[PDB]
Write a structure and sequence with these properties.
Chain B: Belongs to the sigma-70 factor family. RpoD/SigA subfamily. Chain B: This is RNA polymerase sigma factor RpoD. The structure is cut from a larger assembly and holds chains A and B. By secondary structure, chain A is α+β, with helices and mostly antiparallel strands. Chain A has 35 helices and 62 strands. The relative contact order of chain A is 0.08. At the A-B interface, loops of A face helix 1 and helix 3 of B. The structure holds rifampicin.
Chain lengths: ~1350, ~50
């Protein structure tokens, strides 16, 4: 706070105005929080293993009154720790130990138990564990599980207008999507007949489900329709009239009652007439006997005398039917209230299409729909229908499903049953009809309130759930016949069934993938990623604001199907996406933060991230740009309920790292944030000269760096480890302590890059908690450096920059700055063949002494021996007996007297063209085969190296503890010179006067002895892990893994890009002599083609250049005053000037800093350049940039004169020169490049195939055939698809001619077509080749 | 078949799974034959397996 210790080393000058109210949270939050909820002890149904347990439990047998319940669970210590788990290849996992209680109820109970055996913690499976950095290790490889985005469980009402039937009229459909179980779909049709289908199955008339719920027709009309009361009073047909019923209808007869005619015939009833009837309270009017000719009778009507049905429910009455029910004494007749506009007569017409009658009928017709063709049964239909939506087992909405369900139905309860109830189905139908009636609207799938976010924690729970159901069937099956006290909860519950559910997910699943680690940003941008069809879902939605990044998505087959998480976004309590906001009460902007979900934010009026307020925080302008409901417009001063937290929150970590983003077109911006993840780390971690201010946060939040656990002073600094002596205020009373950081050294990444940590602090320096102790790869002094900035000139240079091509000075490759270190893992397997076992022995037929030189006696290359293409890394030989040679080979051996060995050479040799240094060797051996010499040496080395490390722990630790005892002993009994004389081991005897200090000595004693023994146990375990024979695959006797470190610099063909989306491929590496130089004589590193700038609209790349130039100026200047050794005063003065820069920025600054030791160190770090921070949308402006160029001594234009290093003459016009940050992506040319002359061939069809990593030939496609067909080239095409590939004969007959000097082809027939003939002929088809 | 049976009990009985030589002592024969027998006993993989 108010500046840390590594901040005193270097400070980034920050332009930008808007003060940051909230600072970027942990970027890895989602991944860690989710998994943290899965595995945890939660005393309730909140999501977790506890919840997944409580669902399926207790498990009772079949009627046998034998029940198995669940007590509690625990996670055993991991078999291997994270580092060890990677080397061996097993998964990083913990044993799951769960206590089970087996109760058996006495047969023919009152419920009571004969005996109950409590089986102590039965083990089921080992579940993977998440690393402190949020990754998983499946088989020896760090893998990330991407969060998924799917449709939230609940009810959803859609349209399907347009395309259907092309008559318009739209449609309205509802869909009930449970978290688990079958789908329930309701839909209309062009006839306004409501239909239902379970899942995607056959369409069925909607009402058929209501009957299966035991609802007769009378109650269906009574549910969905209102009642028009008809009275026969005195004689001939009176009627009850609700005065509102006359809206939207024209009088069909004289509407008169109470001796006064309210409406005549042919006069439509408007608001005036309705008012008269409403205000005059006209209950009963006289109607004609013919009006009921269309009215559908509500309930059943029978003849009281004859006991016969006069008319069934849902029947249209007629003038003749009225007669037959009138003489029977019926006063009242209920009919449907039907209006083709307001309340539609839909259900009525749905019943007339219903083939069923009663519940059993519907159940028969329903059971035969799902499982057709088989005879229906009553018990079968009942069981099925109750098991679909009414069974707690086969159906659940869980909490989110029930909540949105109730929420979308306008209910009160936010939580409820996890199955469907008859009330639920009826309500859903009601809502669908209401939308068709015009009151209410349909949802849209793209809204982020209907899009729910899962993540590792939620997904693993489902798989573990699946494991428990497939084990459930087994437990019941055994408890069926079980003998009383013999079996216990072990013989039943297996391991393999449950473990394989979880194992099949993390091992192979589309959501579990290799972490993309070539780059810290790549990691952190992978760990935040989403996954979800036509263009609607791919497109950006208004609800994406602050939740999903609009501009970071892949460009390709799936666009907008990935996105990435926004900066400040958080998973909602229920699992939606919520974003930070500021509550604006009255006219003040309050700094209380409020998280609003997608549906929550909708109604509020939210201000803009960019707005002007001041003092008390009253809006300066009388109206400010805001967005309210799905749209944005100008809003009045005091209306706004909330305001945006920060200017960044719209974008993502990727996009937030692009300086001057506001100035770049979104296409190039996308590509930029897409390409920035590919930047391979460099040899010298540099720093961005132009920046944002996220780079610090990205570096730290990602685990690539090493952060201080507790603050203090550095006791010891080595390139290996770092030991910090903790401050006492931060230190716990017992054990005293020091924090020991073991740094990661050079090692292979997933992408074969180098990940190596370097100490950024110096001996005996104050460090505060949360300070960077050591940089990782591609991080500099706590910031994130994905590349190296360099001097760049925009101008066409003799076409060598032609398209995007980049022309780079030799100075760059000489400085070795863009050099890159690759670590490749090569393997050698000694397998077992029926002919015999393969030997790793160093005796290889037909190799000279120079070849076997680099190998030790055992046959393995020495560690550290530099190798090139073709050198033998591991000698290996496999038995092949009875070679069966030929006459002339036999004479050859006879003349030269060589004994042809019974063993063939399989030895592992360095791939063609790659050259590096051997940094490591591992030897895995089958358990029971004798470890060879070298393998034993390695084991001995690992043993000794292990002992040194552990001893180092104990040595520094013990001193750290005894150094505290020295201090506590001096309080109350101080003897200074006396105490350090006697042996340190004898200190533990001295007590103290009554005080807590006597108890403090006690505390330090206990923990001391603990360490003594903890060290012991740790050493033993390590030793066993070394000596234990590693488990290998079937058939493999031993494996040798060699680790080569190749150092590649840069060469034509490599891909290079800036943060602004400008790609490039280095064309020529030009001498420093030919480089354009300025009057001062300093050449320029890179010459970019300006023509790429206007077409692709990215203007930031120019700004980034300009400000960069300015930045280097402030650097260069300091480099002069430091080389002048002026004094602290002059330096201090000039720096202060820089950090203010003319007005109104948020930076603040010094004279609190110590004027000597702290200031001089800062200037030394600035002399390379002055780091500047351009916030994403708050970033600097031209004027600010031009003023910094004034302080720079450099022109405002940003252009200068340059001279061609060849002719030495000037260049017409000034050219823009500056400093642009540039990344080296890993496409590097010596990977992509392949060439093949004659390689191996596929067996099934003879075709070129790389088996040696000598790549198969290029694929010649159909389109290329057309290309040859358009040219007149017949012979090139024949040779292309016959002799060069598919002709097993023609190829050899050709090769022999090529060396003989005869260019011809004796083509023959491609073997592919020759196979098609037999394949056709394998059928009953006789296919012959005719004539001649 | 005899091996599967032992591997079943021994799966949870041992808490991990019997070592390749564990069922070997349980079984009558020379006990190194586990490797040989286990290999030829495996069913061939469909050459049409999508990868
Ligand atoms: C198990 O997952 C696999 C396939 C699932 O199948 C399948 C059908 O379901 C997918 C899911 C669920 C994805 O989320 C996905 C994806 O997110 C993505 C690409 C596109 N990949 N590219 C391919 C290479 N190319 C030169 C560039 C574009 C994909 O094809 C897929 C993909 C599938 O196709 N892209 C990105 O996210 C962006 C823009 C950057 C990616 C980061 C790096 C590159 C990857 O993480 C690398 C390190 C590995 O992780 C992958 C290799 C995974 O493979 C393994 C075994 O790990 C792969 C996703």
């Amino acid at each position: 706070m108010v500046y840390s210790y590594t901040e005193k080393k270097r400070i980034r000058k920050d332009f930008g105005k808007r003060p940051q109210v909230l600072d970027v949270p942990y970027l890895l939050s989602i991944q860690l929080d989710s998994f943290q909820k899965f595995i945890e002890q939660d005393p309730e149904g909140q999501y977790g293993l506890e919840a997944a347990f409580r669902s399926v439990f207790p498990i009772q047998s079949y009627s046998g009154n034998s029940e198995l319940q669940y007590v509690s669970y625990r996670l055993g210590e991991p078999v291997f720790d994270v580092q060890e788990c990677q080397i061996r290849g097993v998964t990083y996992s913990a044993p799951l130990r769960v206590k089970l209680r087996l109760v058996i109820y006495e047969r023919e109970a009152p419920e009571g138990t004969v005996k109950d055996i409590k089986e102590q913690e039965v083990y089921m499976g080992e579940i993977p564990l998440m690393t402190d950095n949020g990754t998983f290790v499946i088989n020896g490889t760090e893998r990330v599980i991407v969060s998924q985005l799917h449709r939230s469980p609940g009810v959803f009402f859609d349209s399907d207008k347009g395309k259907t039937h092309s008559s318009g009229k739209v449609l309205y459909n509802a869909r009930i999507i449970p978290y688990r179980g079958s789908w329930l779909d309701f839909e209309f049709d062009p006839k306004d007949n409501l239909f239902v289908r379970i899942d995607r199955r056959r369409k069925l008339p909607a009402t058929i489900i209501l009957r299966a719920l035991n609802y007769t027709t009378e109650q269906i009309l009574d549910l969905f329709f209102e009642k028009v009361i008809f009275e026969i009073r005195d004689n001939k047909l009176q009627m009850e009239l609700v005065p509102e019923r006359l809206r939207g209808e024209t009088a069909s007869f004289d509407i008169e009652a109470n001796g006064k005619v309210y409406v005549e015939k042919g006069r439509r009833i408007t608001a005036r007439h309705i008012r008269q009837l409403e205000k005059d309270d006209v209950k009963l009017i006289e109607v004609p006997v013919e009006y009921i000719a269309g009215k559908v009778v509500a309930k059943d009507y029978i003849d009281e005398s004859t006991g016969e049905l006069i008319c069934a429910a849902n029947m249209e009455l007629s003038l003749d039917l009225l007669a037959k029910l009138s003489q029977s004494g019926h006063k009242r007749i209920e009919t449907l209230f039907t209006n083709d506009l307001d309340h539609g007569p839909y259900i009525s017409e749905t019943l007339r299409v219903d083939p069923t009658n009663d519940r059993l009928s519907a159940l028969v017709e329903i059971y035969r729909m799902m499982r057709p063709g088989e005879p229906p049964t009553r018990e079968a239909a009942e069981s099925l229908f109750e098991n679909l939506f009414f069974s707690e087992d086969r159906y659940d909405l869980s909490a989110v499903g029930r909540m949105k369900f109730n929420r979308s139905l306008l209910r009160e309860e936010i939580e409820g049953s996890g199955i469907l109830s008859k009330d639920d189905i009826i309500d859903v139908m009601k809502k669908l009809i209401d939308i068709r009636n015009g009151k209410g609207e349909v949802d849209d799938i793209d809204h982020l309130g209907n899009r729910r976010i899962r993540s590792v924690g939620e997904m693993a729970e489902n798989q573990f759930r699946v494991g428990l159901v497939r084990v459930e069937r087994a437990v019941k099956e055994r408890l069926s016949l079980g003998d009383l006290d013999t079996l216990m909860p072990q013989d039943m519950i297996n391991a393999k069934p449950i473990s394989a559910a979880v194992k099949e997910f993390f091992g192979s699943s589309q959501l579990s993938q290799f972490m993309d680690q070539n780059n810290p940003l790549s990691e952190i941008t992978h760990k935040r990623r989403i996954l979800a069809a036509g263009f609607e879902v791919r497109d950006v939605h208004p609800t994406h604001y602050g939740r999903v990044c609009p501009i970071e998505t892949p460009e390709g087959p799936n666009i907008g199907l990935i996105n990435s998480l926004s900066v400040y976004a958080q998973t909602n309590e229920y699992g939606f996406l919520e974003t930070p906001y500021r509550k604006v009460t009255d006219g003040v902007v309050t700094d209380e933060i409020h998280y609003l979900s997608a549906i929550e934010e909708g109604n509020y009026v939210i201000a803009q991230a960019n707005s002007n307020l001041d003092e008390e925080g009253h809006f300066v302008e009388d109206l400010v740009t805001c967005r309210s409901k799905g749209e944005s417009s100008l809003f009045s001063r005091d209306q706004v309920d909330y305001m945006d937290v920060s200017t960044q929150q719209v974008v993502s970590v990727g996009a937030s790292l692009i300086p001057f983003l506001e100035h770049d077109d979104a296409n190039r911006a996308l590509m930029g944030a897409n390409m920035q993840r590919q930047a391979v780390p460099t040899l010298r971690a540099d720093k961005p000269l132009v920046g944002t201010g996220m780079e610090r946060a990205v570096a730290v939040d990602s685990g690539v760096t090493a952060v201080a656990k507790r603050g203090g002073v550095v006791q010891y600094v080595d390139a290996s480890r770092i030991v910090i002596k903790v401050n006492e205020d931060e230190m716990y009373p017992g054990e005293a302590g020091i924090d020991i950081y073991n740094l990661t050294k050079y090692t292979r990444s997933n992408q074969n890059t180098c990940i190596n940590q370097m100490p950024c602090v110096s001996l005996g320096e104050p460090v505060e908690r949360g300070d960077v102790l050591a940089d990782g790869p591609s991080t500099d002094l706590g910031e994130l450096a994905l590349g190296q900035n360099m001097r760049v000139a925009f101008m066409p240079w003799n076409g060598y920059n032609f398209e995007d091509s980049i022309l780079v000075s030799e100075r760059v490759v000489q400085e070795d700055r863009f050099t890159t270190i690759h670590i490749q893992e090569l393997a050698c397997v000694s397998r077992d063949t029926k002919l015999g076992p393969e030997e790793i022995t160093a005796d290889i037929p037909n190799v000279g002494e120079a070849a076997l030189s680099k190998l030790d006696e055992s046959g393995i290359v020495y560690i550290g021996a530099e190798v090139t293409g073709g050198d033998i890394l591991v000698g290996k030989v496999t038995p092949k007996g009875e070679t069966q040679l030929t006459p002339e080979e036999k004479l050859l051996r006879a003349i030269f007297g060589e004994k042809a060995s019974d063993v063939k050479d399989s030895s592992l040799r360095v791939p063609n063209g790659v050259s590096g240094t051997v940094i490591d060797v591992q030897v895995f051996t089958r358990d029971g085969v004798e470890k060879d010499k070298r393998a034993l040496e390695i084991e001995e080395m690992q043993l000794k190296q292990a002992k040194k490390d552990l001893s180092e722990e104990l040595q520094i630790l013990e001193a750290g503890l005894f150094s505290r005892i020295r201090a506590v002993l001096v309080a109350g009994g101080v003897e200074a010179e006396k105490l350090d004389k006697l042996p340190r081991d004898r200190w533990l005897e001295l007590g103290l006067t009554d005080e807590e200090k006597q108890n403090q000595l006690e505390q330090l004693a206990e923990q001391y002895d603990e360490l003594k023994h903890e060290f012991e146990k740790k050493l033993e375990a390590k030793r066993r892990k070394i000596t234990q024979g590693d488990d290998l695959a079937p058939g493999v006797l031993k494996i040798v893994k060699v680790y080569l470190a190749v150092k590649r610099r840069i060469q034509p063909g490599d891909k290079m890009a800036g943060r602004h989306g400008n790609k490039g491929v280095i064309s020529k590496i030009n001498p420093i002599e030919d480089m354009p130089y300025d009057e001062n004589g300093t050449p320029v590193d890179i010459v970019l083609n300006p023509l790429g700038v206007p077409s692709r609209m990215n203007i930031g790349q120019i700004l980034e250049t300009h400000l960069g130039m300015a930045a280097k100026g402030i650097g260069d200047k300091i480099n002069a005053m430091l080389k002048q050794q002026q004094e602290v005063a002059k330096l201090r003065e000039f720096i202060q000037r820089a950090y203010d820069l003319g007005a109104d920025v948020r930076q603040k600054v010094d004279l609190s800093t110590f004027s000597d030791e702290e200031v001089m160190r800062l200037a030394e770090n600035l002399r390379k350049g002055m780091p500047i921070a351009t916030p994403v949308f708050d970033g600097a402006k031209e004027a600010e940039i031009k003023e910094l160029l004034k302080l720079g001594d450099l022109p405002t234009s940003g252009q200068i004169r340059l001279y061609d290093g060849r002719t030495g003459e000037q260049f017409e016009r000034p050219v823009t020169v500056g400093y642009m940050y540039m990344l080296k992506l890993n496409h590097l040319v010596d990977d992509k490049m392949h060439a093949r002359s004659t390689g191996s061939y596929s067996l099934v069809t003879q075709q070129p195939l790389g088996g040696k990593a000598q790549f198969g030939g290029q694929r010649f496609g159909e389109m290329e055939v057309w290309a040859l067909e358009a040219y007149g080239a017949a012979y090139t095409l024949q040779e292309m698809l016959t002799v060069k590939s598919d002709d097993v004969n023609g190829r050899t007959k050709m090769y022999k001619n090529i060396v003989d000097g005869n260019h011809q082809m004796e083509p023959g027939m491609p073997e592919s077509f020759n196979v098609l003939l037999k394949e056709i002929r394998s059928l009953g088809i006789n296919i012959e080749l005719e004539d001649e | 078949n005899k091996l599967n049976r032992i591997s079943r009990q021994m799966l949870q009985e041992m808490g991990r799974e019997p070592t390749p030589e564990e069922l070997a002592e349980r079984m009558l024969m020379p006990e190194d034959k586990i490797r040989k027998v286990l290999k030829i006993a495996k069913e061939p993989i469909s050459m049409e397996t999508p990868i």
